[PDB]
RNA sequence: UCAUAGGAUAUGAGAAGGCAGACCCGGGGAACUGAAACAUCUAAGUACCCGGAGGAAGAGAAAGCAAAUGCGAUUCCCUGA
RNA sequence: GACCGAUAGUGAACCAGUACCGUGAGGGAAAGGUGAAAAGCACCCCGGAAGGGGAGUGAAAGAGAUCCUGAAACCGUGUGCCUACAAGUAGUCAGAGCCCGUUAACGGGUGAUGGCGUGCCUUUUGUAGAAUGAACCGGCGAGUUACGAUCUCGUGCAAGGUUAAGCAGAAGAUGCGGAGCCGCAGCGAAAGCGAGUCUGAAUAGGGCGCAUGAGUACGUGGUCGUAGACCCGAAACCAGGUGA
RNA sequence: UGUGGGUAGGGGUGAAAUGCCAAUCGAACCUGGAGAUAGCUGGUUCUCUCCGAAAUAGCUUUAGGGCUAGCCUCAAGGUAA
RNA sequence: UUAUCCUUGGGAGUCAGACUGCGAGUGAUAAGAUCCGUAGUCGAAAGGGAAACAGCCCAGACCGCCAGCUAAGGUCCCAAAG
RNA sequence: GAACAGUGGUAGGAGAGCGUUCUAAGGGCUGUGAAGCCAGACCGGAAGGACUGGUGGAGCGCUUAGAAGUGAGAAUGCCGGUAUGAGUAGCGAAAGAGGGGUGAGAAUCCCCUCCACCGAAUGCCUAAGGUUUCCUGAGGAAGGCUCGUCCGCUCAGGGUUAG
RNA sequence: AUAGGCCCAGGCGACUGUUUAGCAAAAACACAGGUCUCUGCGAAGCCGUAAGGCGAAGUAUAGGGGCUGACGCCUGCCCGG
RNA sequence: GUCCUAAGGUAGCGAAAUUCCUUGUCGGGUAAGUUCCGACCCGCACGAAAGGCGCAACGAUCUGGGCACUGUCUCAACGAGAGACUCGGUGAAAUUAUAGUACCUGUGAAGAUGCAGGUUACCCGCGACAGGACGGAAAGACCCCGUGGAGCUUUACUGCAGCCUGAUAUUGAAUGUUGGUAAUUGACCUUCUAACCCGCCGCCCUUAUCGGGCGGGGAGACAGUGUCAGGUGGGCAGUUUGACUGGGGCGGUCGCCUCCUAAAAGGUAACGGAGGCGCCCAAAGGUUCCCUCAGAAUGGUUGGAAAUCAUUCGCAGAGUGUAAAGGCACAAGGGAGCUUGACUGCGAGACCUACAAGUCGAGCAGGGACGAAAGUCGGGCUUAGUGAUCCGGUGGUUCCGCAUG
């Protein structure tokens, strides 16, 4: 039984998935430090009491409630507001 | 008794 | 054995050394001295006895 | 016969007060040019053996006080 | 040449060989196996062969142990671990 | 002797390292039971004998040597029910007829005919499987024990718990034996400090601890480790021998 | 072709086929190391009850093996998360 | 409304999956093909239906009954019911 | 005891039990019949347990606890027995026939007659090897591929002589 | 009864021999012949740890090893590896 | 002619025991010839002692063709004997889950005596035949797999024997000669004899081709042997020689980053589709301050399609060290000044995750850079640019240091 020779692919590579995106929900309580969003670039901007890390990670600078919110016409931010106290 | 056998090479 | 994955102990570094001249003391807290009588001369030999 | 201690493990782990196993970190031998100061600062500190690993190895350190 | 080698004779409850399928002290000494392969390493100075025993053998009366107010031949058991 | 009881226990309960196998080194079986006592069946009969049937002996001879018991497979004789128009993993549920009569039960045997229904095991995504294993019956035949570890449960004692060797003592219990072991304190690579300690310049922060207290000895059980380690099975490797 | 002999296994012997060396030969036979090792195949014996998977991820000289995680179970807690 | 969920500890097994529907790749928009995603069933699930038929449709067997109602699928005869 | 709910299951986890041998302590049974074995229409949710009769002819239950060589249907498992195939394949190169005899019995043993086969052997001698198989008398269970009065077989005796 | 079939032509091996006991008898092996090469004798080569041996009671016209394979005609080029 | 080589295959033979294409082509033989013989030569891939080409004789050799001959065949017939068959005697075996064991079409682990629907079939044998029971026999030799063996190879690895070579011991005496050291020690050559050697001769032990002794002779501090050392060394030994894979081999791949597949969280496979990485930058880093890009049109010396200049239009059609994606014009793009935070100690809390690792981080302290200050700064718009442990090196060190220092 004859078997035709076959070629090869020059593809077959991919990097590890980086588990990007939202890490806390709108309206969820977070502690200071909590990563809110992982991203390349600013898909979402740091709002009130939120920071942008060296790799564009958005994180809560205080304890409080996460609010994702429209930032002008085209953009989005995420903010953390203190609880009513 | 065969040289090779059943379903030989 | 982890089926050929480098075992955890081999992945991690050896640390430190053992002192030949290490001294371990029999420790006694104050609560244990409270069990003796008043004005007692508490000594190692008495504690041990 | 008595169980023999695993001597490699005994040279690398230590039992804590609550019966956890203290360990050092990997990646602390060489190639420090390729690791950030943050990494190097963190790998310097001790760590604990994980739950999954502890169940695998606890009997190998049974004799250690 | 002396002599020696060699030869002859006499005397010897002199040796020889066996045997415990054991234990003991020596000479020689594997490999499978484990290491998830393998060579250092392991198995193991084991099995086996050889020599020598003795009722036991071997060791033994400090060119020792230690680091005390020290101990006081060796062997073996417990422990150290 | 909380060892074996004739496939066990020695290979060997017996004339066994025999018989038998192999040139040899070497391998290596099977095979126990009359009865309390031989009282081991005088005599008669069929038969050449074997073997029987009587008669005797004996508690028993259907204990007569192939001799305690005497299962199953397997082989027969007799016969209650069924069976020569039927398509069958063989049963099961329904069911007349015929034959019986019990641990007396809404009983037993047989079964015309009707419905349903592709063994068991192993291994598989999936096996009625046209995959594997078993002729049948019987016997034998596979997670054990020791010493350590750990957890649960139990018991004793409890910030303590416990002895080993040894000595005495039934090969015993037990008494003695505190050397040793674990625990009551941790942290640190270590010196060391100590309810703290390490890192650090730090009265910072952080790690591990304390505060937030239970262990230890023994036993049963589960699991692990070292041992052949649940049982059976290679091809091979090495050592010392036996063979032209 | 007879008789008597010689060579022995990490070895003999070979007018060479890896042939032959006691019906055994790419390394004889016997015993022992030895219950070698076997991530492989087969097998693993009474009953009922409660609960009840997986056939995935990661890493692996790994791919029909293993380890940790996932999913099962038993206990004790927390408790209502 | 429901009764799970978490922690710690003891004990596992599993790491060959199958088909079906739906969303993709590979293939020839072949395969009872292969490889993912997602739901189901089988696996480890007997019963009824689909003639027979692991994976489809209906549906989850603690036992007994010569009671009743239904599901899918059916109701001329085989074969229960027009 | 009520109610309510639940009770398919492989790997596997957990629980509760059945039975086997042995031991200890109670308590018993048994020659007026133990265990084992055979039979039955009995009992328990299962493992299993009784009762009755027969055989058997001397040992054995029960309770509680302990300890295990503790349960078999599968291993092309080991050993033994016995089937199936089956009254089947086979009965191993070859010339016998008849008469007589012996005998419980005769194709098969003995005798006779003719016939047939070997004859550089299928004859005579003798190695090695075997070891009594040799001779005589008696025998017929097994051996002999049938039979058997026969035999290389069984039992008794006997038999091998060297300057 | 017993007692060559023969011929024409080609491949391979010159020939008689030998071989896979038990699936191969051959074109394979051997062979006489060729050639290369080693060996001055306690030879070289070979067996053996060694002693001791074979070689050989031989001595280069001899001995060992490699390749070729009667005979005939022949056997070119390359010493970089 | 040119390139290359150590040299480019001579003689002879050639579709061959060698020729894939191939039944090459032509001729012969036959009615017809993929075979055979003779020629030819595009020799896939003959070729000169792993000999080339011939070759009488020889062959249980292989090949092609003839004569003779025939049951080889057309095409089979009859006969003899041995079995088979019947009777009497004797009496195995392999196999075997239990079987009351039809056929067709279908179904099903995809090829059914046994399942479904039909069709057919009274019960029991005997002689025959082999279609099926995936018949029996032998745990498939092929193939794959096992981190299973064994035999064999070598420029696989590591060893060992053997062999060669040196030092040193056994091992001494002279002589010159030539190196450090003006008189002392090494190296070298030659000579000696007395160790050692003799598989030389005579004598003796002694009836002895062993051995020993004695005396000659030869050789000689060499050889041999011991210890140590280097070289050589498939002669021999132990072993290794990956995995994935639409079977294996061969090809390709193996870690990291980006995108798509990926089903609008995250994750998600294939030897699916595309690309990158194993760095670079002393500024291309930090900060303060200032800024705006591509391209086009029009004008203008050299000067063009396009150099520099000017105007106008100009969400970016540019740039962002580098792949891609996500971002970026209050720039993250461009320019300039000053700098070294491309800091040390850390770190609430998070993400990711089997583990090992990986990521983000406000904030605190120390001491700084830039800034008037606010403040920013623990490298770079973000996401690759990397590798555990063991072992070893280097620097530091209020640590240990086997009686004590
Ligand atoms: K070894
Ligand atoms: K026996
Ligand atoms: K029926
Ligand atoms: K098969
Ligand atoms: K602290
Ligand atoms: K307790
Ligand atoms: K235990
Ligand atoms: K075990
Ligand atoms: K040989
Ligand atoms: K699917
Ligand atoms: K009875
Ligand atoms: K069996
Ligand atoms: K003749
Ligand atoms: K007779
Ligand atoms: K040959
Ligand atoms: K022809
Ligand atoms: K010829
Ligand atoms: K099948
Ligand atoms: K047939
Ligand atoms: K395929
Ligand atoms: K700057
Ligand atoms: Mg084909
Ligand atoms: Mg960065
Ligand atoms: Mg370091
Ligand atoms: Mg190994
Ligand atoms: Mg003595
Ligand atoms: Mg008996
Ligand atoms: Mg016995
Ligand atoms: Mg004999
Ligand atoms: Mg009786
Ligand atoms: Mg009796
Ligand atoms: Mg009897
Ligand atoms: Mg009819
Ligand atoms: Mg009828
Ligand atoms: Mg039918
Ligand atoms: Mg399959
Ligand atoms: Mg199988
Ligand atoms: Mg079978
Ligand atoms: Mg070997
Ligand atoms: Mg011999
Ligand atoms: Mg001989
Ligand atoms: Mg032979
Ligand atoms: Mg061993
Ligand atoms: Mg359930
Ligand atoms: Mg495997
Ligand atoms: Mg797990
Ligand atoms: Mg799948
Ligand atoms: Mg499929
Ligand atoms: Mg399964
Ligand atoms: Mg289910
Ligand atoms: Mg079902
Ligand atoms: Mg049906
Ligand atoms: Mg099934
Ligand atoms: Mg009807
Ligand atoms: Mg149910
Ligand atoms: Mg009994
Ligand atoms: Mg048993
Ligand atoms: Mg059986
Ligand atoms: Mg008959
Ligand atoms: Mg007959
Ligand atoms: Mg027959
Ligand atoms: Mg017949
Ligand atoms: Mg016959
Ligand atoms: Mg005959
Ligand atoms: Mg006679
Ligand atoms: Mg007879
Ligand atoms: Mg010839
Ligand atoms: Mg010849
Ligand atoms: Mg042959
Ligand atoms: Mg021959
Ligand atoms: Mg032949
Ligand atoms: Mg010599
Ligand atoms: Mg000689
Ligand atoms: Mg030749
Ligand atoms: Mg030739
Ligand atoms: Mg030449
Ligand atoms: Mg032609
Ligand atoms: Mg013709
Ligand atoms: Mg050639
Ligand atoms: Mg040549
Ligand atoms: Mg089916
Ligand atoms: Mg089908
Ligand atoms: Mg069919
Ligand atoms: Mg069948
Ligand atoms: Mg077959
Ligand atoms: Mg069959
Ligand atoms: Mg097989
Ligand atoms: Mg073969
Ligand atoms: Mg080799
Ligand atoms: Mg080995
Ligand atoms: Mg592979
Ligand atoms: Mg392939
Ligand atoms: Mg490759
Ligand atoms: Mg989605
Ligand atoms: Mg997504
Ligand atoms: Mg290492
Ligand atoms: Mg010191």
PDB file of C-alpha atoms (C1' of nucleotides) in Angstrom, chain F residues 10-121:
ATOM      1  C1'   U F  10       9.686 -32.379  55.246  1.00  0.00           C
ATOM      2  C1'   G F  11      10.859 -34.003  48.645  1.00  0.00           C
ATOM      3  C1'   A F  12       9.975 -38.319  51.926  1.00  0.00           C
ATOM      4  C1'   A F  13       3.804 -40.584  57.750  1.00  0.00           C
ATOM      5  C1'   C F  14       4.615 -45.909  53.176  1.00  0.00           C
ATOM      6  C1'   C F  15      11.700 -49.843  52.164  1.00  0.00           C
ATOM      7  C1'   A F  16      12.522 -41.865  49.200  1.00  0.00           C
ATOM      8  C1'   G F  17      16.651 -39.026  47.540  1.00  0.00           C
ATOM      9  C1'   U F  18      13.723 -44.669  46.144  1.00  0.00           C
ATOM     10  C1'   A F  19      11.121 -45.468  41.275  1.00  0.00           C
ATOM     11  C1'   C F  20      11.606 -42.845  37.028  1.00  0.00           C
ATOM     12  C1'   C F  21      14.220 -39.247  33.745  1.00  0.00           C
ATOM     13  C1'   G F  22      19.357 -37.615  32.069  1.00  0.00           C
ATOM     14  C1'   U F  23      26.055 -39.413  29.003  1.00  0.00           C
ATOM     15  C1'   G F  24      26.757 -36.292  33.199  1.00  0.00           C
ATOM     16  C1'   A F  25      26.454 -32.488  36.775  1.00  0.00           C
ATOM     17  C1'   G F  26      21.615 -32.870  37.942  1.00  0.00           C
ATOM     18  C1'   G F  27      16.171 -33.333  38.224  1.00  0.00           C
ATOM     19  C1'   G F  28      12.863 -36.089  41.151  1.00  0.00           C
ATOM     20  C1'   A F  29       7.565 -38.474  42.158  1.00  0.00           C
ATOM     21  C1'   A F  30       3.163 -41.290  43.423  1.00  0.00           C
ATOM     22  C1'   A F  31       1.677 -44.152  47.439  1.00  0.00           C
ATOM     23  C1'   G F  32      -1.643 -43.579  55.127  1.00  0.00           C
ATOM     24  C1'   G F  33      -6.900 -45.970  57.554  1.00  0.00           C
ATOM     25  C1'   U F  34     -10.326 -54.306  57.580  1.00  0.00           C
ATOM     26  C1'   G F  35     -11.684 -55.197  62.580  1.00  0.00           C
ATOM     27  C1'   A F  36     -11.567 -54.543  69.591  1.00  0.00           C
ATOM     28  C1'   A F  37      -9.574 -59.080  68.167  1.00  0.00           C
ATOM     29  C1'   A F  38      -7.958 -62.367  62.240  1.00  0.00           C
ATOM     30  C1'   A F  39     -12.370 -64.338  64.875  1.00  0.00           C
ATOM     31  C1'   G F  40      -8.941 -63.138  57.431  1.00  0.00           C
ATOM     32  C1'   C F  41     -15.038 -66.527  55.345  1.00  0.00           C
ATOM     33  C1'   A F  42     -14.754 -74.658  57.447  1.00  0.00           C
ATOM     34  C1'   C F  43     -18.532 -76.534  54.305  1.00  0.00           C
ATOM     35  C1'   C F  44     -22.028 -76.516  49.926  1.00  0.00           C
ATOM     36  C1'   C F  45     -23.232 -74.696  44.977  1.00  0.00           C
ATOM     37  C1'   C F  46     -22.101 -72.308  39.451  1.00  0.00           C
ATOM     38  C1'   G F  47     -17.320 -71.514  37.125  1.00  0.00           C
ATOM     39  C1'   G F  48     -10.858 -73.855  33.985  1.00  0.00           C
ATOM     40  C1'   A F  49      -9.954 -69.707  36.989  1.00  0.00           C
ATOM     41  C1'   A F  50     -11.497 -64.768  38.182  1.00  0.00           C
ATOM     42  C1'   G F  51     -15.850 -63.805  40.399  1.00  0.00           C
ATOM     43  C1'   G F  52     -20.249 -64.859  42.630  1.00  0.00           C
ATOM     44  C1'   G F  53     -24.703 -67.151  45.745  1.00  0.00           C
ATOM     45  C1'   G F  54     -25.417 -69.451  50.300  1.00  0.00           C
ATOM     46  C1'   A F  55     -23.357 -71.011  55.129  1.00  0.00           C
ATOM     47  C1'   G F  56     -20.198 -69.431  59.044  1.00  0.00           C
ATOM     48  C1'   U F  57     -17.264 -65.339  62.069  1.00  0.00           C
ATOM     49  C1'   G F  58     -18.281 -60.497  63.685  1.00  0.00           C
ATOM     50  C1'   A F  59     -21.614 -55.129  66.737  1.00  0.00           C
ATOM     51  C1'   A F  60     -21.253 -54.408  61.404  1.00  0.00           C
ATOM     52  C1'   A F  61     -19.088 -58.324  55.686  1.00  0.00           C
ATOM     53  C1'   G F  62     -23.182 -52.897  51.432  1.00  0.00           C
ATOM     54  C1'   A F  63     -16.052 -53.824  57.466  1.00  0.00           C
ATOM     55  C1'   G F  64     -13.827 -59.544  52.848  1.00  0.00           C
ATOM     56  C1'   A F  65      -7.898 -56.908  51.601  1.00  0.00           C
ATOM     57  C1'   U F  66      -9.286 -52.739  44.875  1.00  0.00           C
ATOM     58  C1'   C F  67     -11.121 -53.639  52.964  1.00  0.00           C
ATOM     59  C1'   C F  68     -13.291 -46.258  57.961  1.00  0.00           C
ATOM     60  C1'   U F  69     -16.403 -42.381  55.637  1.00  0.00           C
ATOM     61  C1'   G F  70     -17.451 -42.671  50.550  1.00  0.00           C
ATOM     62  C1'   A F  71     -19.265 -36.028  47.554  1.00  0.00           C
ATOM     63  C1'   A F  72     -19.113 -34.547  42.253  1.00  0.00           C
ATOM     64  C1'   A F  73     -18.055 -35.327  37.284  1.00  0.00           C
ATOM     65  C1'   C F  74     -18.892 -39.762  34.416  1.00  0.00           C
ATOM     66  C1'   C F  75     -21.430 -44.750  33.323  1.00  0.00           C
ATOM     67  C1'   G F  76     -25.962 -47.747  33.829  1.00  0.00           C
ATOM     68  C1'   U F  77     -30.980 -50.341  35.147  1.00  0.00           C
ATOM     69  C1'   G F  78     -36.196 -49.326  36.114  1.00  0.00           C
ATOM     70  C1'   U F  79     -40.275 -45.919  35.157  1.00  0.00           C
ATOM     71  C1'   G F  80     -44.500 -41.154  36.694  1.00  0.00           C
ATOM     72  C1'   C F  81     -45.236 -37.086  33.073  1.00  0.00           C
ATOM     73  C1'   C F  82     -43.820 -35.322  27.978  1.00  0.00           C
ATOM     74  C1'   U F  83     -42.014 -36.120  22.893  1.00  0.00           C
ATOM     75  C1'   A F  84     -41.739 -38.130  15.385  1.00  0.00           C
ATOM     76  C1'   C F  85     -45.109 -30.391  11.266  1.00  0.00           C
ATOM     77  C1'   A F  86     -40.656 -28.900  14.522  1.00  0.00           C
ATOM     78  C1'   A F  87     -36.604 -23.248  13.875  1.00  0.00           C
ATOM     79  C1'   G F  88     -34.862 -23.971  20.298  1.00  0.00           C
ATOM     80  C1'   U F  89     -28.417 -19.112  24.956  1.00  0.00           C
ATOM     81  C1'   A F  90     -32.812 -23.877  26.535  1.00  0.00           C
ATOM     82  C1'   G F  91     -34.965 -20.316  30.785  1.00  0.00           C
ATOM     83  C1'   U F  92     -38.773 -17.269  32.509  1.00  0.00           C
ATOM     84  C1'   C F  93     -43.961 -15.683  33.070  1.00  0.00           C
ATOM     85  C1'   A F  94     -48.956 -17.564  31.404  1.00  0.00           C
ATOM     86  C1'   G F  95     -51.183 -22.524  31.099  1.00  0.00           C
ATOM     87  C1'   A F  96     -54.641 -26.955  30.337  1.00  0.00           C
ATOM     88  C1'   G F  97     -54.032 -32.246  30.837  1.00  0.00           C
ATOM     89  C1'   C F  98     -51.966 -36.385  33.428  1.00  0.00           C
ATOM     90  C1'   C F  99     -49.438 -38.317  37.827  1.00  0.00           C
ATOM     91  C1'   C F 100     -48.664 -37.528  43.060  1.00  0.00           C
ATOM     92  C1'   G F 101     -49.415 -36.216  48.252  1.00  0.00           C
ATOM     93  C1'   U F 102     -45.535 -32.362  51.752  1.00  0.00           C
ATOM     94  C1'   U F 103     -41.260 -29.437  57.113  1.00  0.00           C
ATOM     95  C1'   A F 104     -49.448 -28.239  55.012  1.00  0.00           C
ATOM     96  C1'   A F 105     -48.161 -24.626  52.263  1.00  0.00           C
ATOM     97  C1'   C F 106     -53.056 -19.351  48.122  1.00  0.00           C
ATOM     98  C1'   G F 107     -48.590 -28.002  47.853  1.00  0.00           C
ATOM     99  C1'   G F 108     -45.005 -31.506  44.636  1.00  0.00           C
ATOM    100  C1'   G F 109     -43.629 -33.797  39.564  1.00  0.00           C
ATOM    101  C1'   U F 110     -44.359 -33.348  34.285  1.00  0.00           C
ATOM    102  C1'   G F 111     -45.519 -29.811  30.606  1.00  0.00           C
ATOM    103  C1'   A F 112     -49.444 -29.396  24.950  1.00  0.00           C
ATOM    104  C1'   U F 113     -49.548 -24.427  23.810  1.00  0.00           C
ATOM    105  C1'   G F 114     -48.796 -18.633  24.248  1.00  0.00           C
ATOM    106  C1'   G F 115     -45.630 -14.114  25.456  1.00  0.00           C
ATOM    107  C1'   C F 116     -40.694 -12.490  26.399  1.00  0.00           C
ATOM    108  C1'   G F 117     -35.632 -13.666  26.025  1.00  0.00           C
ATOM    109  C1'   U F 118     -28.269 -13.309  21.794  1.00  0.00           C
ATOM    110  C1'   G F 119     -24.333 -17.806  28.230  1.00  0.00           C
ATOM    111  C1'   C F 120     -20.513 -16.398  32.098  1.00  0.00           C
ATOM    112  C1'   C F 121     -15.841 -13.878  32.594  1.00  0.00           C
TER     113        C F 121
END
